[PDB]
Each structure stands twice: as structure tokens, then as C-alpha cells.
Amino acid sequence: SMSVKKPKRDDSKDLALCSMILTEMETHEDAWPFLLPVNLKLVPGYKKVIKKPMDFSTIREKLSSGQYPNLETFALDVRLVFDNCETFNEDDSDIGRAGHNMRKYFEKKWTDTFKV
């Protein structure tokens, strides 16, 4: 509270580390369904069903332009990518499988990088 400061982690490396994690995401062979925005004019239903579309290139732009206040808001957008994927795609499909794989891949890198 007021004048009662909690010790908090050094956050000076977070921007660089998040960029590093995102690069690893982008270069994963199963990243292809998530590299670019889903084309709202070619994919029926997507615009109406998915209220907050997100993809790696949008995340990269926001990261590079100071639009994440902290690492937690960055993680929310990454997870949003895979939550959207589950909403629109069957688990037993190429894209569906891709999503589960990429989520698992992210969460380990997240733990290994920041949960010291």
C-alpha cells in the first residue's frame, strides 16, 4: 500500500526476452497457421465468432512499438492466439493440432525464462 513497497523483480530484460521467445515461436515449423492475421474476408464465420483476433505478426508489431505494459499482457495475447484457434478449429485437424503444440511450446519457454 502507500509507502509499503513490495520487493519486485528486475524487469529491464523483459522486452528482449519476450522478443526472443516470440522469435522462437515464429520459427517453429507449426507456426504457419498463426504467422499472419486470419483473412476476415476469405474465412466464413471468423469475424462474427472470434471477437478478438490475434496472430504472431500483430504481437510482433505491438511488442516493437511499446504497446505491452508488462510481460503479463504479452502472455495474454499469445494465449489469445491459441484460445481463438481452439474456438474455431477441431482438435483432430492440422490447425487444431498445431495450436495445441504451439501452446505447449510457449508455456515451457515462459516457465523456463521467467519462473526462474
Ligand SMILES: Cc1ncccc1N[C@@H](C)c1cnc2ccsc2c1
Ligand atoms: C489459425 C486459423 N484459425 C482458423 C482459420 C484459419 C486459420 N489460419 C489461417 C492462416 C489459414 C487461412 N487459410 C488456410 C487454408 C488452408 S489452411 C489455412 C489457414
